Design a protein around this nucleic acid. Structure first.
Lengths: 132, 104, 384, 61
RNA sequence: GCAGUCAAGCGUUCAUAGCGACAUUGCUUUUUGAUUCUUCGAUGUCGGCUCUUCCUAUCAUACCGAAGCAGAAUUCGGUAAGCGUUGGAUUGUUCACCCACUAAUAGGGAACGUGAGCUGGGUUUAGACCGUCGUGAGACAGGUUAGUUUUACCCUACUGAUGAAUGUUACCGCAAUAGUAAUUGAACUUAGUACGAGAGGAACAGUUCAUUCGGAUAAUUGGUUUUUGCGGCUGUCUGAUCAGGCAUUGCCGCGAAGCUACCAUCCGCUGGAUUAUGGCUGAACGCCUCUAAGUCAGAAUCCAUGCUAGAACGCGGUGAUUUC
RNA sequence: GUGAACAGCCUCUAGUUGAUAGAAUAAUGUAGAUAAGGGAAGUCGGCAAAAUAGAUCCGUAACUUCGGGAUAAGGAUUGGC
């Protein structure tokens, strides 16, 4: 379900509590796995900017909690290399929640969204106010 | 899914350690839906029945309705049928009798 | 008992033994396949790696996401002085392999090649090639018999060349000698090529052209006796281990009661011979030009030597080859460049590149100016 | 090829050099090296650091 | 545990497409028993972590055969161990059991691999409480707590490192033999096309990237700081100022050179011969047949090209060879 | 002298300058360290380390044998002249 993305550095292992970017009621998301990750003995699977992860709500509305639902990383604090040359990194991690088809439940996203996340997912680029 | 039973006891295995026996009605149906891997998430139950197909073929078919929830206010009921391959092994309690250490 | 968690192997088994190489010049194991319909040229070359710098080019690759986009990329600059031929050597074929038959050296030899034949030059009477040079001094019948021996017999022909070390900022005065096989046609013609090129220079641009896939053969950077974790990439033990944690726990089972050849063990790391393939040539610059660093999109007069020179090497004021990505072997190392063994097609060989900009800032750390002509325009008038 | 100026002090940034920083209110900060990138995190004022171009523009050097 | 043969009941009407109980003939040592052969002048007796290699009774991957195979999705069988087989909650766990990813989360052996490799949770010393039993000391493999893990410098093995002797000495090569490495997945396109009553819904070639693994490498970005390089600060000491000592590297910011990381970039080749199966010609048997004589195509296989080492008792070509 | 102090750190009187030494700076140890992003996913178990800390001011819950809990929690401030 995921299109082609150039490799960027892995900055969110399993267990990372990242912020929640949209206004769907949640406050933070707890990454438990990454769609399309690999397999190695004692290696933790990790997420990057633009990956689809499975994530649970630890704080927010009581309707959303205690169930697993997929989500999309939109910001990242670990620096990655763009092909034009500059190394960039945001201030904090963030994630919006979505269905497994990729459509977003949220209405609008606060703060900026990474550019390589906007090209990879169409519905994220609709809700995005600021793209980098 | 898979159900283990004994060919010398004819007695079904509950997955932790137990050995609830077989009536194929009203008590065998109870153990067989805990193994159904469905979760209590969205069914809570609707109705369950099984199909006759064959006595000696090691497959038991069950059909069940769910009555789950899809949208914010939509309760909805659908149905489907599951086919359990039944795997034969030993009862350690009743493979013990072949060792002459029977009484204890 | 079985293994209880499958995991792929640490290390590669086709690169054993990790022992020190026999010499700093790594040998070319295999030369490309000859095609005798084509004219005579060389098949490999010698040079000295200097350093690395950054490049920017417009990527032209259809169906990609970065199409017609600037990409920064890492290149190496190998200092490549002109190489002069001193002799030819012809090989006949046996059932036991290829056997050397006759090597014919030229008349005059420089002082650089004579350094190779001696271990104590200053005490030596410098008597190498004195009785050989008297053969040319007469009518020359002793040598025309020898090249006619190679024309009749001798399936393949190599050519002994050597680098010019005086045109290079190394402190070494001794030249490096090597064989290079020719891949022209009709081996009576190969030896007539080398006959005319005795004590004649061979430039770089005649051998290699731009946008060509080549290989790189040299001796790896050495590191000395290293431990089993950094040598193979094996797992560190936990913190609570008595007497060591940077080790490998189980050497092997009971049976067989011998340490197997496949387990990981500490030893020599580095200074191996490696062949790396598929490195793409970006720029073949000449020596007598102040525009080595210039580009059609840059239009500034500078050489590719950075501000303050390359670290540990010096000044590139010669011909050079600028090839994409890292090369095995550190700086100052004698490096062989070989043509590709097979014709490549896929998409990446046939692509032609034109640069945007060459990075010439100081490599000696956190450099922020490209040329000292424009450092003075930024900071202005200083005290000194 | 564009040469961007340093956000902190004054320096020219050739392509493939230094870092970039996007603050949480969507403002882009460029840095030439880790010197001005580490002094930015200390909340230091670049009008009072002596080696910056922003200082020497102010006190008329 | 596992595989044959025989094929009851079934698969709406059809013994064998496919499930298959019961009878019958065998194999294996990954169970549980039986035995007492070796060891009681001691083979350190559970599990986990770490690491290599072997097996095939194949979960995935490659190429095929059969179906109650239209497509899609499956199910059954052949060659085949080249290559891959995970991240977590609870339990001392082996075993189990759920959660989530994935091409897939296959089964096993090597003194039930591996304690002078570790850890000591468990078990199996001495302390102590409980419960039932006992008149009493005490019993319980019932439950729960606290409890020292010793030596390698010797020899072989392996990993690296020198070396006498072949007239001396220097340089350039040949290649006997041993090793060998790459692996998988998505996306677009082919195409909403073939197929289909529809609902639904492909593949080969092509393009672009990614997973696992491997070799290197330091331009750039990040890490490290005894450059004690420059600057800052506290307490004391040299009368103050300068310039310094001491605080087992006094601390803090920055910090080049070096080493270094999927925390960084780069690179990872194409030919022959076959297995499983599909064919040609063609008898045995006036027909028919892939097979008997011959022969064509064909797998992640085998051998080469390529890659690493270079026999210290494998060898060749050249330079100079001690009047003085 | 600093400081709440016979704590720690430095100096005066007095004492000692003894503890086999030289040269290089591989592996693996011992002792002391720092680390990008994530933060117990490690493990029988947060073992080990890290963070917190001195002072003045504000503010302090349940429970209770009314004594306590209590430095509870939590939040500011500190040089120099």
């Amino acid at each position: 379900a995921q299109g082609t993305k150039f490799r960027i550095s892995l900055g969110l292992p399993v267990g990372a509590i990242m912020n929640c970017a949209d206004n769907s009621g949640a406050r933070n998301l707890y990454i438990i796995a990454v769609k399309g990750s690999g397999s190695r003995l004692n290696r933790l699977p990790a997420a990057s900017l633009g990956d689809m992860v499975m994530a649970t709500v630890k704080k927010g509305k009581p309707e959303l909690r205690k169930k697993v639902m997929p989500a999309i990383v939109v910001r990242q604090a670990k620096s990655w290399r763009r092909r034009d040359g500059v190394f960039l990194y945001f201030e904090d991690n963030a994630g919006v929640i979505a269905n497994p088809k990729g459509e977003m439940k949220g209405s609008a996203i606060t703060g900026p969204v990474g550019k390589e996340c906007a090209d990879l997912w169409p519905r994220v680029a609709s809700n995005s106010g600021v793209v980098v | 899914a898979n159900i283990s039973f004994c060919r010398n006891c004819e007695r079904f295995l509950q997955p932790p350690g137990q050995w609830i026996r077989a009536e194929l009605e009203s008590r065998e149906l109870l153990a067989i839906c805990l193994r159904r891997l469905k979760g209590l998430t969205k069914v809570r139950l609707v109705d369950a029945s099984f199909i006759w197909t064959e006595p000696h073929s090691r497959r038991i078919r069950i059909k069940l309705t769910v009555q789950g929830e899809a949208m914010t206010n939509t309760i909805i009921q659908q149905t489907f049928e599951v086919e359990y391959i039944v795997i034969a092994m030993q009862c350690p309690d009743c493979a013990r009798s072949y060792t002459t250490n029977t009484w204890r | 008992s079985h293994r209880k968690y499958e995991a792929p192997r640490h290390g590669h088994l086709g690169f054993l033994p990790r022992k020190r190489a026999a010499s700093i010049r790594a040998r070319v194991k295999a030369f490309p396949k000859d095609d005798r319909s084509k004219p005579v040229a060389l098949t490999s070359f010698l040079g000295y790696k200097a350093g690395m710098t950054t490049i920017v080019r417009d990527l032209d690759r259809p169906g990609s996401k970065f199409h017609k986009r600037e990409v920064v990329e890492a290149v190496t600059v190998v200092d490549t002085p002109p190489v002069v031929v001193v002799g030819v050597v012809g090989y006949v074929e046996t059932p036991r392999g290829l056997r050397s038959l006759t090597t014919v050296w030229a008349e005059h030899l420089s002082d650089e090649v004579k350094r190779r034949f001696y271990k104590n030059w200053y005490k030596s009477k410098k008597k190498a090639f004195t009785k050989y040079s008297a053969k040319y001094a007469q009518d020359g019948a002793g040598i025309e018999r020898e090249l006619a021996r190679i024309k009749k017999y001798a399936s393949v022909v190599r050519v002994l060349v050597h680098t010019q070390i005086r045109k290079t900022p190394l402190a070494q005065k001794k030249a490096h000698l090597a064989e290079i096989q020719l891949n022209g046609g009709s081996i009576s013609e190969k030896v007539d090529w080398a006959r005319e090129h005795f004590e004649k220079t061979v430039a770089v641009d005649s051998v290699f052209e731009q946008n060509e896939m080549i290989d790189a053969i040299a001796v790896t950077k050495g590191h000395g006796f290293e431990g089993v974790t950094h040598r193979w990439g094996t797992k560190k033990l936990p913190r609570k281990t008595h007497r060591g944690l940077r080790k490998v726990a189980c050497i092997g089972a009971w049976h067989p009661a011998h340490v197997m050849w496949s387990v990981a063990r500490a030893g020599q790391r580095g200074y191996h011979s490696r062949t790396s393939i598929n490195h793409k040539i970006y720029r073949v610059g000449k020596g007598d030009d102040e525009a080595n660093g210039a580009t059609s999109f840059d239009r500034t007069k500078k050489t590719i030597t950075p501000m303050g020179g390359f670290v540990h090497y010096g000044e590139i004021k010669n011909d050079f080859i600028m090839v994409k990505g890292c090369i095995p072997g550190n700086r100052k190392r004698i490096v062989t460049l070989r043509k590709s063994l097979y014709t490549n097609t896929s998409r990446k060989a046939l692509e032609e590149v034109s640069l945007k900009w060459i990075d010439t800032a100081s490599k000696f750390g956190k450099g922020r100016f490209q040329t000292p002509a424009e450092k003075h325009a930024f900071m202005g008038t200083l005290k000194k | 090829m564009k040469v961007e100026i340093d956000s902190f002090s004054g320096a020219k940034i050739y392509p493939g050099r230094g870092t970039l920083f996007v603050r949480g209110d969507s403002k882009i900060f460029r840095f030439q090296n880790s010197k001005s990138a580490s002094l930015f995190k200390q909340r230091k004022n670049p009008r009072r650091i002596a080696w910056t171009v922003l200082f020497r523009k102010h006190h008329k050097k």
